[PDB]
Design a protein around this ligand. Structure first.
Ligand SMILES: N[C@@H](CCC(=O)O)C(=O)O
Length: 266
């Protein structure tokens, strides 16, 4: 009650199914505003906004990126993280991974979803573990360039992860600027490409047509997605409280089931 509720809060996000996607276009109907979007993060944004009694406007991130340290970006970060640092958005509500490096420059709520880095292959590919990737030649691999998975491997102290880092950094052409390009490569490379991809994305894709991909191995780490705000945001406490409210009252579980379990489909 001591924050501006007339302001339409600007929410940075990023199209990434099923977290956020465009509603299917139809004949003679033009969608505008937030009505253009659907998905888990749309539903989450709606609920958070209702908890806080605020209006919001989704504005997709202007470089299509999650956020990385970049010696060219103003404020030192690109993507959604940079939009928050530079106060171009009020909140980011996306599948944004909570990392130690990002916590030094923006704030996160407690996590609304858990996840881990995982491996996606085309069915038939002879890979069962991360170790396997480093012990063979014909299957190339990669991940989303410069995002949290990229940084995990760069920074990990585990020999295996460092081995995978050295490979990917020396073979950046086998990594991708969107998960959808990586998934296309899995599907089109005849068993010769594996994608390092966060588990909720992996699980979603594998349970939907064309049913030609699968997850192998255990998750490599354990991680969360959080609602992010610029430091100092008057909304920081109330947004964290709202996430905890939605967690406790079963609403996060309900929309996770809506977009993952209710969409299977394989
Ligand atoms: N969720 C990741 C993007 C995907 C990835 O890095 O695998 C991030 O916030 O950077």
């Amino acid at each position: 009650g001591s924050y501006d509720r007339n302001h339409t809060y600007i929410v940075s996000s990023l199209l990434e199914e099923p977290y956020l996607s465009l509603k299917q276009y139809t004949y003679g109907e033009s969608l505008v505003g937030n009505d253009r979007f659907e998905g888990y993060c749309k539903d989450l944004a709606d609920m958070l906004a209702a908890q806080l009694g605020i209006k919001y406007e989704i504005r997709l991130v202007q470089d299509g990126n999650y956020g990385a340290e970049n010696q060219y970006a103003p404020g030192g970060w690109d993507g959604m993280v940079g939009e928050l640092i530079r106060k171009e958005a009020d909140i980011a509500i996306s599948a944004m991974t909570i990392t130690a490096e990002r916590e030094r420059v923006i704030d996160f709520s407690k996590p609304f979803m858990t996840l881990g880095i995982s491996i996606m292959i085309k069915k038939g590919t002879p890979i069962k573990t991360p170790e396997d990737l480093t012990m063979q030649t014909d299957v190339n691999y990669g991940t989303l360039l410069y995002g949290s998975t990229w940084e995990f491997f760069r920074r990990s102290q585990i020999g295996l992860h460092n081995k995978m880092w050295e490979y990917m950094n020396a073979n950046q052409h086998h990594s991708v600027h969107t998960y959808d390009e990586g998934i296309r490569r899995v599907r089109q490379s005849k068993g010769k490409y594996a994608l390092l991809v966060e588990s909720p994305k992996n699980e979603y894709v594998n349970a939907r047509p064309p049913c030609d991909t699968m997850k192998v191995g255990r998750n490599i780490d354990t991680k969360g997605f959080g609602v992010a705000t610029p430091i100092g945001s008057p909304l920081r406490k109330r947004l964290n409280e709202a996430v905890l409210t939605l967690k406790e009252n079963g609403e996060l579980l309900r929309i996770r089931n809506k977009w993952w379990f209710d969409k299977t489909e394989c």
